[PDB]
C-alpha cells in the first residue's frame, strides 16, 4: 500500500544460536605493565536478547585464568517475538503467536503484520492471497497476533512473520525453524538380548548369533526406524585368597647366630619374611622404617656365613668338618633368593654350584656328609628315597641359581639335564607325598612333568588340596608348598585356590624348633601365589557384524581396558542379521529398534476436557467453554488461554461479571485494555472440577469485518505443567474449529485457497476460453449437468453427469459415466450449483482425488466453472453471446481442438 | 655435634617439582651435600641425583630441586637420601600419582537432541601452568555407561584441548557427564555435567529473592519473598505469578498446598508471604523448633499477560534458624602453647554459608576481648592461657547489638596442650596481623619464643618455610638476638602465595641432660582469592548507546602477554534455564584448595605433629623425625 515498507523489501532477522564466537585469540600486542589488551571486531546475531561472554586464558607464567562474565545487551524499539514450539506433530492444527513489541516511550505504531506462506504448511496465507492485519500498537506496550497453521510435511520446516509500521520507515522480520513429527509416539522394542561367551556357548570357538527383524506391525506409514546394535564387555574380577597378615610374621626377624649350620637356621626367617613382605607390600602396617633393620640382619647372616667358606667353596658346621651336600645347596637356595635384598658375591654361590656340580655324582647326588641338625632339612628326614629328595633340593637349588651362575659355570645346564633324565626315569612308583610333590616342582621348572607322570602328581593329592602322608605335619606343610609352587609353574589356576586355601587354613606363621624348610617354602609359595597374580581373567573377544545392507563386514575388539564402553551400531533397514563371536572372555549383545507406533489411544488432551462452543448470540456470537480435569481429584489453579476470531472482541460487562468471586479472575491489565487490539484473553481458574464441566460463557462482538475469519482457540492447562493441556478452536461459519483440508493415509493437502475461477473482472470472450483452455496445464474438459449435491459437514460432493467430452486426459472417463467434484462448504453460496443445471468445467490433473476406482474431483483455484444455459434461454437474446460462445468453444475444441 | 635435619614435603608427586630443604646445624666450613631419591623398596632405578654445597656464607642452609619422572591399589612410597659428608640421611615419604588438574568447559549448561557440544579441557599442573601430557576423554550417558572414549595429547596446544561431540537425534535425556583424566593417573579423574533435554528459550528471567537470607521461627511475619521478572533484553514484565512453598529435611521435600498464591507481577515485580500459621499447619508438628535445622524452598511461575511465555524459577536452602549467625572454629588450631597467648581466627557467617561483615564477638567470662569480624567475616581473638596441661575449652558468643540474647550465636571448641621434648618447657609462638592480605604487600610474621634463661642465648635463629598449593614456594631463616623474646619477618606477598599459605618455623638445641631438642610450630594464612595475572572483558568502542541485531562491535580483551585467550558467547535464556556446572575461578581454586596435603590451621600435639599436619616431614641424624604418612588423603574420611 502507501507509505509502508513493502513485504519483498523486508529482510528477516534469522540467526538465533543459543551459543557462538567460540573463537581462539592471542595476545601478541606490546605489553603495558604486562597487560596485552587486544581489540577485536565481532559481528552481532539478530537475536534480541543479552549476550554472556566468557573469557579464558593459559600463560606459560600466569597459568590459567576465568574472567568475569562480560554482559552486551541487543535491542530494538519494535519487534518480533515469534513464540514457536519445540515440535509440532504433522497433520495437527496449531496455533501459534507472533508477539509484537513496540518499546518507544510515548508513540503509537500503527503496524500491518503478514504471515507467510509456505507450501509445507496449511494457513490463510497463499500464493494468490497475503495473510495481513492492521493492528494499532500503543506506546511502551505489547499486541499479541495469532496464527492458526497445520504442518504438511515432516522434518525441519520454517516459519516467517513479517511486520512494517504506516508513515515511517520501521519494519522487522522472522524467520524460524521448527521440528514437525510423525503422528504416532515413539516407541522401541527390545528385538535381542544376547549373552556372549564362545569360549563357553561356541563350538570350535566361534558362537554365532542369528537376530530377526523387529516386528513393525504398529509402524506408522512412511516413518523411518533405526535399529541400535549394542556390543559390551563383561568384566569379571577373579579371585584371589588374603595374604597371611603382616603382624603374624613379626616374630620371623630374628638375629642370626651359632655355626655353620645354626647361622641360616636364624637367616632363613629373616630373608623369607623380607622376600614375603616385599612382594605383598605389607611394610606400610608393618612399618616402613623396619625394614632397613630388617636387612642389616641378613646382611649380618651373610657376613657370619662367610666365615664358614671352606677353600672349596663349599659349607660345613666347622671349618675342619667335610662339606656338606644339602647344607651347601641350602646356602644356594637362600643366598639366591636374597640376592634381590643384600650384596651377594658370585664366587661364593657360582662357585658353590660348581662345587655341587661336580660331586653330585648317574649324575645323582649324595651327601657324603649328612649335616648336624637333622630337624632343619624337613622332609629329607626319612631314610625312603634319599636320593630322589635331595636330587629335587640341590637340582631346584641350582635352577634358582640359573640366571645368576649360568655364565661362569658352564656345566649347568647339561647337570640340571642329567638330574632331570634321573627324575624322569624314576619319578613313577615313588609314592610317598613328599617325594613326589619336590620331584615334581624339580621336574616343572624344565616343563618335564606331562602325561601319566603329571597325573600320577595329580591324584596323589589328598582332598584335591594337600600333599599329605602320615607323619610330622611341617613336612605335609613343607610338601604343599612345593605342590603349590608347581601349580604356579604349571599355571594350572583351576588347582591352585583348594591348595593355597588349606595352606592358609593351617595358620602356620613358621618359626620354632625346626622349622626352617616349612618356614622358607610356605613363605616362598605364597609369595609366588601373590606374584603370579590372576586378578583379572582375560578378556579378548572378536565379534564381528554381518547386515544384509552392508557390503563388508563390521568387526569389534572387545579389550579388558574398555570393557565397559558401549559399542553402538546403527541401520535404518529393518533387517536380520548375523553376529559371530570368537575368544576369551564374556559379553552383552542387545538389538533395540526405535521406530513410531501408531496410538489408539489420544495424545491430545489426556489431563483435560475441553468444549468450546460458538451460537450466534439472539453480528454478536456466544463463546462457551467448559472444562474437566481428568484426574482423581479436582485440578488445581489454571489458564484459560482464549484468542479471539479476526475481527472480535470481548463484551466488557460479561467479562466484569465473570472476573468477581466465583473461584474465577481476569487482571486489571486485560478489563483496562480497549475494546481495540484486545484479541487474546486470560481466565484464570482457581480450580477446576474433575467431576463434571465447569463451564463459563461470554459474548462477543464483531469490530471488524474481513472476508475471511481465522478460528479462535481456547487453551486449558494447569499452572504447574504447560505440556499437560488441551486446546480447541472455534469458527462461526460451520466448522468444528478445524481449517479446510482433505487427508488421506496421512497425507493432507491444503484446501484453504479461491473457490474457483471468477471471471468478474471484466468480461470473458471466445478467444479466452479457446487459449485458456488449450494450456498443457488444463487436462479435463467437460460438458457437465448436475445430477446430485450432496451436502456434508466438512465438505460438499458434487455428483455430476459428463454429459459430453470435450477434452479427456487422465481419466479416462466416458459420457454417461458420473464424477464427483469436491469442494469446501464455504464455497457453496460462491459455487451457486443448482441441479438438472449444466456447466462447462474444466480442470487441472493436480486436482485428482485420489485413485482411478472411486476417482473424485477437486474444484480448486484453478478449476473453470461456468453456468451453461439451457436451450430455451438460449432463444432469449440476452444469453445469446455466451450461448454463441459455448457452441462455438465445444464445436472448435472437439472438432480442431489444440493446435500447439 | 653438626647436626643434619631435611625436610621434605609429606606426599610426593610425579612430572612435578619439588623442593627438598637441607639443614647442617653447629657446622663450620663447606658441607658437600648429595641427594638422591630411589624407588621403594627395591630401588632398581636412581630416580634422582642432584648435588649442593651448605657455605657459611648461606648460614649452612641449601635447597634441591627435584622431579621424578613418571616410571612405569597400594600405596606407592620412595626412598629419599641425602649424604652430607660422612653422614647419611634417608627418609620414606608416600607419593602421589596426581599429574595436575584438569577443567572442563562446556560452551552451553543444556543442550536439545541434534545439537553439538563445544567443549575445551585445560591441562594444568600442581602450579596450574600449562602442561603438554596425554588425556583420556570418556562420554557418559545418565546412566553411567561410557558412550565414547579418547585419547588426545595436550602438546603443542598450550595447555588448551578443543574438542566436540555431536548430540544424536535419538537420545536419552537427562543429566550427561564428560569425565577426563591424565593418562598416568586414572584415579584422578575430572568431570563436568551438561543437560540434555527438549526445549526452548525463554524470552525474561524470574528470580526469586525472600527479605532475609534465612527464616526466624519465631517471626510472626512469616517468611516474606519477592517476585522479581524482567525481559532478557532489560525491560520489565507485566504478568502474573504462582507462587508456592515447601519445607525441606535432608532430601525429604514436603509442598504446603495451603501456600499457594497467584499474585499480579506489575512493573517487573510482585511480593508474596507465607505466613507462620500457614507454615505451622502444613507440618503436623506443634513444637517449632522441630522445623529448626530444616530449611524452606520457594517456587514461583510467572506467565505474560500475553501467555505466549512462561518461567519457572525456584529459591532453596533457605535455613530455619534461631540466630542469624554462626559460629566457626574451622580456621583456629586446636592445639595451644601453656602459659603463651592463645590466637582464635573466630569465623561468623550468615546461615547461607555467606561470610557476615562487622559482627561482634567475644569469649564467655573475657568481655574485654571483643573484635569485630572483618570483610570475609573473620575476627581475631587472643587470649592468655595458664602453664597447665589441661584441655584448654573456648566458649565464643556474637555480641551484635539490638538483637537478644537468645538469638545470638555460640560454639564451643577445645584445644589440647603442645607437648614438650622432655617436659623442657620450650616453645614457639607465631602470631600474625588478621586482615585481608592482597598480593603486593608486605605482612609482618610475630615469632615469639619461650623458655629457660639457661639455654636461651643458644637461640640465634629460626628456619621458617611456606607451603603453597602443597609444594614448597620459599623457605629461610630468620636472626634473634639473646634477650629478644619477639621478632618480626617482613615477609614479602607476591601471586605465588593465592590462594592461601602455611608458614611453619621451627628452632633447634641443645638443653637440659645435653639433649638435642627441636620446638615447631606454624600457622594457616589465607590470601585474597583471584587469578594470578588478569583478564578482563569490556567493550571496544564507544558507549553508550546499545546495539542493534546484527550490528558491528568491537570487544576490548585486557590480559597477559602471550597468553592465549578461549572465548565462548551464550544467550541469558540457556541459563533461565540452566545455571550449573559453570567453569569459575573460585571452583579452581576450590579444587586447588580441596587438594592440599595440609589438613590444620596450625600446630600439632607435637613438634613432629606441626610438620606431619602442614605436609612436611621432617628428619634430623640424631634420629628426630615424623612418623611416616600412608594417608594420601586427609582426615577424615
Ligand atoms: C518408548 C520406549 O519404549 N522407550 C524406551 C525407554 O523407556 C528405555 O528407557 C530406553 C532404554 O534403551 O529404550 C527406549
Ligand atoms: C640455589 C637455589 O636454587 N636456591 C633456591 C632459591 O633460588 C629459591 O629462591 C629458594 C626458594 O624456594 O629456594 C632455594
Redesign the pocket.
Known amino acids: 500500500d502507501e507509505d509502508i515498507i513493502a513485504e519483498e523489501n523486508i529482510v528477516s532477522r534469522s540467526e538465533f544460536p543459543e551459543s557462538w564466537l567460540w573463537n581462539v585469540e592471542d595476545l601478541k600486542e606490546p605489553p603495558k605493565n604486562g597487560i596485552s589488551t587486544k581489540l577485536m571486531n565481532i559481528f552481532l546475531k539478530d537475536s534480541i536478547t543479552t549476550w554472556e561472554i566468557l573469557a579464558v586464558s593459559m600463560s606459560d607464567k600466569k597459568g590459567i585464568c576465568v574472567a568475569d562474565p562480560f554482559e552486551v545487551t541487543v535491542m530494538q524499539d519494535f519487534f518480533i517475538d515469534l513464540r514457536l514450539p519445540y515440535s509440532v506433530v504433522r497433520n495437527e492444527q496449531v496455533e501459534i503467536r507472533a508477539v509484537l513489541y513496540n518499546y518507544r516511550q510515548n508513540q503509537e505504531l500503527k503496524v500491518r503484520v503478514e504471515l507467510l506462506h509456505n507450501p509445507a504448511f496449511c494457513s490463510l496465507a497463499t500464493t494468490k492471497r497475503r495473510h495481513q492485519q492492521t493492528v494499532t500498537i500503543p506506546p511502551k506496550s505489547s499486541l499479541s497476533v495469532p496464527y492458526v497453521i497445520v504442518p504438511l510435511k515432516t522434518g525441519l520446516q520454517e516459519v516467517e512473520v513479517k511486520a512494517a509500521v504506516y508513515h515511517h520507515f520501521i519494519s522487522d522480520g522472522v524467520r524460524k525453524s521448527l521440528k514437525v513429527v510423525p503422528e504416532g ?6 528385538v535381542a538380548v544376547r549373552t556372549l561367551d564362545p569360549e563357553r556357548l561356541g563350538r570350535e570357538g566361534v558362537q554365532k548369533e542369528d537376530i530377526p527383524p523387529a516386528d513393525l506391525s504398529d509402524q506408522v506409514p512412511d516413518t523411518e526406524s533405526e535399529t541400535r546394535i549394542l556390543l559390551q564387555g563383561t568384566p569379571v574380577a577373579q579371585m584371589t585368597e588374603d595374604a597371611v597378615d603382616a603382624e603374624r610374621l613379626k616374630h620371623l626377624i630374628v638375629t642370626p647366630s651359632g655355626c655353620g649350620e645354626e647361622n641360616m637356621i636364624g637367616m632363613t626367617p629373616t630373608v623369607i619374611a623380607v622376600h614375603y613382605l616385599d612382594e605383598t607390600e605389607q611394610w606400610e602396617k608393618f612399618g616402613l622404617e623396619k625394614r632397613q633393620g630388617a636387612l642389616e640382619l641378613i646382611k649380618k647372616g651373610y657376613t657370619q656365613q662367610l666365615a664358614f667358606r671352606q677353600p672349596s667353596s663349599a659349607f660345613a658346621a666347622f671349618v675342619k668338618r667335610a662339606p656338606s651336600t644339602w647344607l651347601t645347596a641350602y646356602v644356594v637356595k637362600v643366598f639366591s633368593l636374597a640376592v634381590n635384598l643384600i650384596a651377594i658375591d658370585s664366587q661364593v654361590l657360582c662357585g658353590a654350584v660348581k662345587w655341587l656340580i661336580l660331586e653330585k655324582q648317574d649324575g645323582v647326588f649324595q651327601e657324603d656328609a649328612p649335616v648336624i641338625h637333622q630337624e632343619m632339612i624337613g622332609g629329607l628326614r626319612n631314610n625312603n628315597e634319599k636320593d630322589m629328595a635331595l636330587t629335587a633340593f640341590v637340582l631346584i637349588s641350582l635352577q634358582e641359581a640359573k640366571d645368576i651362575c649360568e655364565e661362569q659355570v658352564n656345566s649347568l645346564p647339561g647337570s640340571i639335564t642329567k638330574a632331570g633324565d634321573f627324575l624322569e626315569a624314576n619319578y613313577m612308583n615313588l609314592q610317598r607325598s613328599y617325594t613326589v610333590a619336590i620331584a615334581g616342582y624339580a621336574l616343572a621348572q624344565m616343563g618335564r612333568l606331562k602325561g601319566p607322570l603329571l597325573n600320577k602328581f595329580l591324584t596323589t593329592a589328598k582332598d584335591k588340596n594337600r600333599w599329605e602322608d602320615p607323619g610330622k605335619q611341617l613336612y605335609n606343610v613343607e610338601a604343599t608348598s612345593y605342590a603349590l609352587l608347581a601349580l604356579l609353574q604349571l599355571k594350572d589356576f583351576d588347582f591352585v585356590p583348594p591348595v593355597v586355601r588349606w595352606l592358609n587354613e593351617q595358620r602356620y606363621y613358621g618359626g620354632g624348633y625346626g622349622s626352617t624348610q616349612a618356614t622358607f617354602m610356605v613363605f616362598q609359595a605364597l609369595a609366588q601365589y601373590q606374584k603370579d597374580a590372576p586378578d583379572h581373567q582375560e578378556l579378548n573377544l572378536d565379534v564381528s557384524l554381518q547386515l544384509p545392507s552392508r557390503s563388508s563386514k563390521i568387526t569389534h575388539r572387545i579389550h579388558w581396558e574398555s570393557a565397559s564402553l558401549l559399542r553402538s551400531e546403527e541401520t535404518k533397514e529393518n533387517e536380520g542379521f548375523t553376529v559371530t563371536a570368537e575368544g576369551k572372555g564374556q559379553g552383552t549383545l542387545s538389538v ?1 529398534t ?1 521406530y513410531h507406533a501408531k496410538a489408539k489411544d489420544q495424545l491430545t488432551c489426556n489431563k483435560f476436557d475441553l468444549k468450546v462452543t460458538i451460537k450466534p448470540a439472539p453480528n454478536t456470537m456466544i463463546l462457551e467453554i467448559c472444562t474437566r480435569y481428568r484426574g482423581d481429584q479436582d485440578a488445581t489453579m489454571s489458564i484459560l488461554d482464549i484468542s479471539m476470531m479476526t475481527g472480535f472482541a470481548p463484551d466488557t460487562d460479561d467479562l466484569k461479571q465473570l472476573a468477581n468471586g466465583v473461584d474465577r479472575y481476569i487482571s486489571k491489565y486485560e478489563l483496562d485494555k480497549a475494546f481495540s487490539d484486545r484479541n487474546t484473553l486470560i481466565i484464570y481458574l482457581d480450580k477446576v472440577s474433575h467431576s463434571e464441566d465447569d463451564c463459563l460463557a461470554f459474548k462477543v462482538h464483531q469490530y471488524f469485518n474481513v472476508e475471511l475469519i481465522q478460528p479462535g482457540a481456547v487453551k486449558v492447562y494447569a499452572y504447574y505443567n504447560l505440556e499437560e493441556s488441551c486446546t480447541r478452536f472455534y469458527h462461526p461459519e460451520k466448522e468444528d474449529g478445524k481449517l479446510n483440508k482433505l487427508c488421506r493415509d496421512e497425507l493432507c493437502r491444503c484446501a484453504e485457497e479461491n473457490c474457483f475461477i471468477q471471471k468478474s473482472d471484466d468480461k470473458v470472450t471466445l478467444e479466452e476460453r479457446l487459449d485458456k483452455a488449450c494450456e498443457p496445464g488444463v487436462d479435463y474438459v467437460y460438458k457437465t449437468r448436475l445430477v446430485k449435491v450432496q451436502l456434508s459437514n466438512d465438505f460438499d460432493e458434487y455428483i455430476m453427469a459428463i454429459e459430453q467430452t470435450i477434452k479427456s486426459g487422465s481419466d479416462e472417463v466416458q459420457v454417461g459415466q458420473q464424477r464427483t467434484f469436491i469442494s469446501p462448504i464455504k464455497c457453496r453460496e460462491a459455487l451457486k450449483l443448482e441441479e438438472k443445471k449444466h456447466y462447462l468445467m474444466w480442470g487441472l490433473s493436480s486436482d485428482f482425488w485420489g485413485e482411478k476406482p472411486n476417482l473424485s474431483y477437486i474444484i480448486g483455484k484453478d478449476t473453470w466453472v461456468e453456468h451453461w444455459p439451457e436451450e430455451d434461454e438460449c432463444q432469449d437474446e440476452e444469453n445469446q453471446k455466451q450461448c454463441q460462445d459455448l457452441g462455438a468453444f465445444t464445436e472448435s475444441m472437439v472438432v480442431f481442438g489444440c493446435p500447439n | 655435634s653438626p647436626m643434619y635435619s631435611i625436610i621434605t614435603p609429606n606426599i610426593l608427586r610425579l612430572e612435578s617439582e619439588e623442593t627438598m630443604v637441607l639443614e647442617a646445624h653447629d657446622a663450620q666450613g663447606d658441607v658437600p651435600v648429595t641427594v638422591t631419591v630411589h624407588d621403594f623398596p627395591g630401588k632398581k632405578l636412581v630416580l634422582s641425583s642432584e648435588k649442593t654445597v651448605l657455605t657459611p656464607a648461606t648460614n649452612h642452609m641449601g635447597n634441591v630441586t627435584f622431579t621424578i619422572p613418571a616410571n612405569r591399589g597400594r600405596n606407592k612410597f620412595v626412598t629419599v637420601q641425602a649424604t652430607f659428608g660422612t653422614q647419611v640421611v634417608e627418609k620414606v615419604v608416600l607419593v602421589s600419582l596426581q599429574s595436575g588438574y584438569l577443567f572442563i568447559q562446556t560452551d552451553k549448561t543444556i543442550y536439545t537432541p541434534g545439537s553439538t557440544v563445544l567443549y575445551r579441557i585445560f591441562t594444568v599442573n600442581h602450579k596450574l601452568l600449562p602442561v603438554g601430557r596425554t588425556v583420556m576423554v570418556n562420554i557418559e550417558n545418565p546412566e553411567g555407561i561410557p558412550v565414547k572414549q579418547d585419547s588426545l595429547s595436550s602438546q603443542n596446544q598450550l595447555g588448551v584441548l578443543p574438542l566436540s561431540w555431536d548430540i544424536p537425534e535419538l537420545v ?1 535425556m537427562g543429566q550427561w557427564k564428560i569425565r577426563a583424566y591424565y593418562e598416568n593417573s586414572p584415579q584422578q579423574v575430572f568431570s563436568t555435567e551438561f543437560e540434555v533435554k527438549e526445549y526452548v528459550l525463554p524470552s525474561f528471567e524470574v528470580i526469586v529473592e525472600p527479605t532475609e537470607k534465612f527464616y526466624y521461627i519465631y517471626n510472626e511475619k512469616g517468611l516474606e519473598v519477592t517476585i522479581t521478572a524482567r525481559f532478557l533484553y532489560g525491560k520489565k514484565v507485566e504478568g502474573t505469578a504462582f507462587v508456592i512453598f515447601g519445607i525441606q529435611d535432608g532430601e525429604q521435600r514436603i509442598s504446603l498446598p495451603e501456600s499457594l498464591k497467584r499474585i499480579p507481577i506489575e512493573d517487573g515485580s510482585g511480593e508474596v508471604v507465607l505466613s507462620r500459621k500457614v507454615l505451622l499447619d502444613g507440618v503436623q508438628n506443634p513444637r517449632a523448633e522441630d522445623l529448626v535445622g530444616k530449611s524452606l524452598y520457594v517456587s514461583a511461575t510467572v506467565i505474560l499477560h500475553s501467555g505466549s511465555d512462561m518461567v519457572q524459577a525456584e529459591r532453596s536452602g533457605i535455613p530455619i534458624v534461631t540466630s542469624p549467625y554462626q559460629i566457626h572454629f574451622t580456621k583456629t588450631p586446636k592445639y595451644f602453647k601453656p602459659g603463651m597467648p592463645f590466637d582464635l581466627m573466630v569465623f561468623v557467617t550468615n546461615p547461607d554459608g555467606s561470610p557476615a561483615y562487622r559482627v561482634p564477638v567475644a569469649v564467655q567470662g573475657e568481655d574485654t576481648v571483643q573484635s569485630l569480624t572483618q570483610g570475609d567475616g573473620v575476627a581475631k581473638l587472643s587470649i592468655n592461657t595458664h602453664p597447665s596441661q589441661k584441655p584448654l575449652s573456648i566458649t565464643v558468643r556474637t555480641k551484635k547489638q539490638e538483637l537478644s540474647e537468645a538469638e545470638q550465636a555460640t560454639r564451643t571448641m577445645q584445644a589440647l596442650p603442645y607437648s614438650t621434648v622432655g617436659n623442657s618447657n620450650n616453645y614457639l609462638h607465631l602470631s600474625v596481623l588478621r586482615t585481608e592480605l592482597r598480593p603486593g604487600e608486605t605482612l609482618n610474621v610475630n615469632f615469639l619464643l619461650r623458655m629457660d634463661r639457661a639455654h636461651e642465648a643458644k637461640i640465634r635463629y629460626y628456619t621458617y618455610l611456606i607451603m603453597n598449593k602443597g609444594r614448597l614456594l620459599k623457605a629461610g631463616r630468620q636472626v634473634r638476638e639473646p634477650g629478644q623474646d619477639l621478632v618480626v619477618l617482613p615477609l614479602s606477598i607476591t601471586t605465588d602465595f593465592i590462594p592461601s599459605f602455611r608458614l611453619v618455623a621451627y628452632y633447634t638445641l641443645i638443653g637440659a641432660s645435653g639433649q638435642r631438642e627441636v620446638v615447631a610450630d606454624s600457622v594457616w594464612v589465607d590470601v585474597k582469592d583471584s587469578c594470578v595475572g588478569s583478564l578482563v572483558v569490556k567493550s571496544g568502542q564507544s558507549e553508550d548507546r546499545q546495539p542493534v541485531p546484527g550490528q558491528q562491535m568491537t570487544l576490548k580483551i585486557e590480559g597477559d602477554h602471550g597468553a592465549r585467550v578461549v572465548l565462548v558467547a551464550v544467550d541469558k535464556g540457556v541459563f533461565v534455564l540452566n545455571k550449573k556446572n559453570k567453569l569459575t575461578q573460585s571452583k579452581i581454586w576450590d579444587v586447588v584448595e580441596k587438594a592440599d596435603i595440609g589438613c590444620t590451621p596450625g600446630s600439632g600435639k607435637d613438634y613432629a605433629g606441626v610438620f606431619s599436619d602442614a605436609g612436611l616431614t621432617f628428619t634430623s641424624s640424631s634420629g628426630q623425625q615424623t612418623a611416616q604418612r600412608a594417608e594420601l588423603q586427609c582426615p577424615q574420611p
Do not use: L
Request: charged share 20%; no cysteine.
Open positions: 509416539i515413539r516407541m522401541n522394542k527390545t533395540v526405535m | 536419552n
